[model samples]
Target: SEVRKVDAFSSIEITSVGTIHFTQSDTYSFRIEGREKYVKNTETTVKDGRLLIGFKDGVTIWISAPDLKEVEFTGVGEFNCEKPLKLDEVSFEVKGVGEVNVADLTCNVLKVALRGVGSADIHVVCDYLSAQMGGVGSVTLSGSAGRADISKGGIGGVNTDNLKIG
Candidate 1:
């Protein structure tokens, strides 16, 4: 683990600060965008099966994880994933005051959990969808799903359309 910048990654686990926007590409590449001087001093670390891109003010990192099967996005940040991404399976956890938006995803199974003041907006085509909300946030889904199990255990909202819930 070196304190340097590089442009490539597998999957990702995001924590704290700012917002993250994701778009799928044909290659597996990653980039950290910020003030050149500030980015030059930042670091990228991958330990214990996680790729960590350090945070700085006004910095946005782009990552393309082609083999991505799991994602954990937490903290007081936002995640906007509006890409045409097709994968085997995907799972996500949103905690704190974070927000997540997903669109145009094709996968086998999709699972998501939200806690705190976090919210998520999702649209996908999968065989199964399992979502749980345990906060004051909301989750909205629009697309097709074979089976879905959505639960709301807190003062949160779950909205869906064109999906079969079992």
Candidate 2:
């Protein structure tokens, strides 16, 4: 396992199957709990407040981002967060075959796009939330929203029974 202190970042991009378990915090760091061979091909780097990382189909990373503003993630992996994330204007794109589980979140405005065979369980309290769903995946959203715009583009299923319209 290796832990590296990274530059402060607000945006991140993930490729391949590198599962990331993270939280919103005042610290910026990356720790990969994987073997040397797998870690070798991983790009745990940060530039211009952006983290672009990849680890194929085998890797678990503990990531900490101070203020998350945007996210572009790719498939066969997952994003698991245990703590609440706070953001003002944020956008998230989850593509390909993967899962996104955000336990809790609070944002002023939010935009999310899910494509391919991706699935998500997101809970957030936001004033404005726009979700664009595509492909044959399932999306479950909960929490409170002042206004929400949800659209579909494929055979994907959406469950928002717990999302209360504020």
Candidate 3:
């Protein structure tokens, strides 16, 4: 496993083949928990308000972030945000078979773009939402959004009752 601690970051982006977990803490750190090959190839960097975590070889990596304001999940993997995440926005782009599960999150905006068979289970409250589902999948959003603009393609759709599309 590889462990590295750094200063606080406002946003995080994961473009790899693994999972990431979050916990509330004062300090900021990143850890890779997997096989030796995967751990060694895992990379973490902070640029501006973005903390990028990924692997070039597409190895599975697990990242842990204590505090984050925004999040972006990409690549073919799973992301679970079941912890108390204070986020203002969220984004997702899936090119392959992937899944994103958000349990407790309240954001101002939530956006998603799917290019393949991927799904996102979002349980959060947002003021604005923009979703474009072009592939064969679904995204379930369970929250109150003041405005929502959604565009769907073949076999793609969004499920939400508390959101009003404009």
Q: lDDT of all the models against the reference?
A: 0.72, 0.82, 0.69
TM-scores of all predicted structures: 0.82, 0.93, 0.78
lDDT for each residue of candidate 3 in 1-166, tens digit (9 for 90 to 100):
6677755676767776677665545566666677777777777778886887777464444345554555566656776767766666667666666777778777787877776787878776778877777888888877667788778885967787655444
- Model 3, TM vs. native: 0.78
Report the C-alpha displacement of residue 143, candidate 2, in angstroms. 0.8
Per-residue lDDT of model 2, residues 45-164, tens digit only: 678988888654488989887788877777468878879788898877887677788888899997878876788788999999898788778788899989999988878677889999
- Give the per-residue lDDT of model 1 (tens digit) for 5-111: 44455556666454667777766555666677646654556666466644544456666655666567755577778878787888877766778888788889999
Error of 3 at 30 (Å): 1.2
| Of 2 and 3, the candidate ranking higher by lDDT | 2
Predicted structure 1, TM vs. truth: 0.82
Query: Candidate 2: which stretches are off by over 4 Å?
Result: 55-57
Error of 1 at 161 (Å): 3.4
lDDT of 1: 0.72
lDDT of 3 at 43: 73
Residue 126 displacement (Å), model 3: 1.9
RMSD of 1: 3.7
